[PDB]
Every structure is written in C-alpha cells, then in structure tokens.
Design a binder for this molecule. Structure first.
Ligand SMILES: CCC[C@@H]1CN[C@H](C(=O)O)[C@H]1c1cccc(C(=O)O)c1
Ligand SMILES: CCC[C@@H]1CN[C@H](C(=O)O)[C@H]1c1cccc(C(=O)O)c1
Ligand SMILES: [Cl-]
Ligand SMILES: [Cl-]
Ligand SMILES: [Cl-]
Ligand SMILES: [Cl-]
Lengths: 255, 252
C-alpha cells in the first residue's frame, strides 16, 4: 500500500490559490494554479498520490540567529512534508539544509517601475536620488544587494538601507502597491514582475535580469523522491509543458 | 587524493593555452570551464587532474544503448567530475548525477543580419531559406518530439530530403550560415559566442526552450551536492556572470 505524500505549499498567486466555488470544497480540490498543475503532471509521470497542506506559518523559509528555520523549509527539515511544491527560490543557504530538485523555473532580479521614465537600468537608478527604489526587506533580492561587491549595487544597497530602510517594503504585494501609487521602483524576482506587467499596462520591467536563480521543488535531505522529481521536471521541460503552464497562468488580457 | 576531471576541447570553455614553450598538466588548458574548476577547487579544497575525454564526445547512446563521451567516463568511474558545457537532459540525468546549472540557456536561431526573418515561425512559413540543426544533438531532439504545430512543420522540413538541412556539428553549421542561405537552430551560448565575433551574423528571436549546463558526477557521488552548493555560492557572488563576460566578450 503506497503512502500518500504530504506536499507543503503556500498561498501565492498564481502558483497556489483557493478556487472560486458556490459549494464547499475539500482536499486538493480546494486549490488551483501553476503549482497544482505541476503537481498533477509530476504525479502522472511518477505515480504518487498526494495531500496538499498549506504551511502553517505562511512562510517560505528563513533561519533566525539561532540557526532555526521556519516556513516550508522547516516542514521539510522536520519531515512533516515530503515535497515543497511552491515557487521556492534555490539559494545557497536553503540548499544546504534541504535537497532541491532541478529548477522548474529560471528567473532573476529585475526592476518593476512606471513606463516613460529616464530610468533604463539599475545604474540609472543608482546615480540619482529623486526616484525612490528598494526591495522587499529580508528577501532574496535584498540579500543580493546586501552582499554584492559590485560598485553600482553597493551604492544602491547604501541608498536602500539609509533613513531607517524607508525604501524597503514589507513584502511583494505592498511593494507593488507602492509602485502603483508613488514614485517608487521595486527590485524583485522577475516572475513576480512579469505577472504584474501582464495586468498593469502602465508598468514595465526595466533592464534585464541582474542575477540568475531558479525555483525548485524542495525535499528533505536524503529524500528518495528528489532525483525522480528532477527527472520528471526535465521530461516536462523537454516536452514544452512547463513553458505552456507558465503561459497559461501568467498571460493577462493584453495591453 | 586528486580528482580526475573529464572535459572536452571546446571554445571558449576549454582550449589549449598558447605558448612559446611546452606546457604540462592543468597549465595546458584555459577557458571558462578551467576558471570554473579553479573556483570550485578553491571552495571545496580538492586537487585535480584534467583529462580530455578520449573520443571527444559529450555523451549519447548508440543503437545498442551503450553510452559514449564524458557521460561514459563518469558511468565507468574513470573520472570523478565532468566540467564542461554538458547539457542537462532527461536521458543523461538518468545515468549520471548533475549539479545544479552553472549556465542557463536555450535553443535559438543563428542567421545573417538585416533580413525579414524575425522568428522560427517566419522560417516555418517558407522553404527558400534552408534551416536546420545539428544532427542528433539537443536542438534536434526538441524539434523531433515537439507537438507545437510550427515546430512540427520545421522538423518535417529538417528531416526531408535525406536530412539535407541538418549539419554534422556546430562548427560546420556556423560555416554553412556564413557561406550559403542557411539558418541554424542551436544552443544560445554558441550563438552568443559567434555573434560577438562575426558581425555578419545575429540571433533571430529569443529562446524557444530552456536548459542548463551542469557539472557531471557518477550516480551516488558525494561531490554532486557539494559542487551544487559551490555553484550556488559563485552564482550569488556574481562570479559565474563575471566569468561568462570574460570569455564571451569580443560588433554593433
Ligand atoms: C510572489 C513570489 C514570492 C517569492 C517566491 N520565491 C521567493 C522565496 O522563495 O523566498 C519569494 C520572495 C519572498 C520575499 C522577497 C522576494 C523578492 O522577490 O525579493 C521573493
Ligand atoms: C559548442 C558547444 C556544444 C554544445 C554544448 N552542450 C551540448 C551538449 O552537451 O551536448 C553541445 C551540443 C552538441 C550537439 C548539438 C548541439 C546543439 O546546439 O544543438 C549542442
Ligand atoms: Cl491546508
Ligand atoms: Cl540537482
Ligand atoms: Cl588530456
Ligand atoms: Cl552527445
């Protein structure tokens, strides 16, 4: 009797969302989105049953000063989940404590800002002070700036952290609202930017990607599923299914 | 002990260093992958001996299912590591353990500048301009199996007339582009390398799929995860990007 895998995930549009329904929904049927479609495709290739559970603390995964982890990462470390199927960024510190699959998405930091401005790059942002710019506090983008030894990015981190980190935002949602309302440019993961620009015709991605990273399925260290999940991901990649899935959930109504 | 690294001669990843005197050992070679190997060695603290794969192949299966190239060196435990632009594919990942990718890339089009061709679709709608790919390589496999209508049509063209539109390898493909009316579909890293050095040529459109290059290790290697963690370190330090710019920089 094959065991049902527990899948930890997080509410995050368009990866995982409650489905709209005129009757109560139960189990996996409660949810829809990119990561649900991904799960269905993985399950079809590998032949496993699964149980989607929202991570209780609603976090991706970071460690405090005591080395203790939270979020989906912690669920995996503690073996309360078999897989984390979510847009979990593959980072050095996370890869040390869990086994990531190969990336099902590749992306990077870029800029979300208004159209029709003199800004065309990170360097354009860096050499001025009138247009405020920043990032989500304590996220992947912030870490990149905090740790970069590139002159242009060091100067941007200095600006970002000045005035008691006023230029930083709490999370991606508040950042996007800030762009929409005030004169503010948001540095963030490009996936998030694409989703927004598809839906907000007055905003745009500026410059290219300034680094590179992927999203991977998380599994516990020593997981017997990680290598199989990787091979399934590569199969979906080569057959063009990941690309199709991304387009399905990202594409807006046109601008 | 010293790790044996299998690799392959391929510009600008691995090249014989130019010298007025004989060179020996690792000092014989230079390129992006040697720079990568240096950085990995610095982080993980291993010594290494670089050895060109005898058959000068990346890794594919013959009709009897036998593997060749760097992949085979790994399967047979004749090398600890493959540090080369080894494309992470479904069939290869089944028989060796790949690191996370140190480069991400995709299929694109190499062609002459200034033409009305702007996408694969523009090629597929016509037959005057020949187009194809390297026979039996990664690009071909994508077309061979795609169920996108436009790519299905292109594969039928490529495979027609005794595969006249296919080429033996990337180098001959590139020559075919420079001398005749021919568009080559291939890995974008190769296209970027060429177009930095030949202002006659350009990339058409964007990437029509996605894939990475990974360090290869034999299945079960304890180095795979350590190498992956080192790659993520270099990625986050911005070092991989730096190394790419160094070796690719050379047109309007
Ligand atoms: C909307 C997608 C959330 C993304 C999905 N991947 C990131 C993660 O795995 O932690 C989330 C994250 C958290 C906080 C800040 C950023 C950022 O872009 O600078 C990203
Ligand atoms: C110049 C670098 C050779 C690349 C490096 N990565 C590929 C590999 O690992 O097999 C090589 C390869 C072999 C045959 C055809 C193609 C293609 O682009 O369609 C690529
Ligand atoms: Cl739940
Ligand atoms: Cl991996
Ligand atoms: Cl040699
Ligand atoms: Cl091959």
């Amino acid at each position: 009797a094959n065991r049902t895998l527990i899948v930890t995930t997080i509410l995050e549009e368009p990866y995982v969302m409650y489905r709209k329904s005129d009757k109560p929904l139960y189990g996996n049927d409660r949810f829809e989105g990119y990561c649900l479609d991904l799960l269905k495709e993985l399950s079809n290739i590998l032949g496993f049953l699964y149980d989607v559970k929202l991570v209780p603390d609603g976090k991706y995964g970071a460690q405090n000063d005591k080395g203790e982890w939270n979020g989906m990462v912690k669920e995996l470390i503690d073996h309360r989940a078999d897989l984390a199927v979510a847009p979990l960024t593959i980072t050095y510190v996370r890869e040390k404590v869990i086994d990531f699959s190969k990336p099902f998405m590749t992306l990077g930091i870029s800029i979300l800002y208004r159209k029709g401005t003199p800004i065309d790059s990170a360097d354009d942002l860096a050499k001025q002070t009138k247009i405020e710019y920043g990032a989500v506090r304590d996220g992947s983008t912030m870490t990149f700036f905090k740790k970069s030894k590139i002159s242009t990015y060091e100067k941007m981190w200095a600006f970002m952290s000045s005035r008691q980190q006023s230029a930083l935002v709490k999370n991606s949602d508040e950042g996007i609202q800030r762009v929409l309302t005030t004169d503010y440019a948001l540095l963030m993961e490009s996936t998030s930017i694409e989703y927004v620009t598809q839906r907000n015709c007055n905003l745009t991605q500026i410059g290219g990607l300034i680094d590179s990273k992927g999203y991977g399925v998380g599994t516990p260290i020593g997981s017997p599923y990680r290598d199989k999940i990787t091979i399934a991901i590569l199969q979906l990649q080569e057959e063009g299914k990941l690309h199709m899935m991304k387009e399905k959930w990202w594409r807006g109504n046109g601008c």
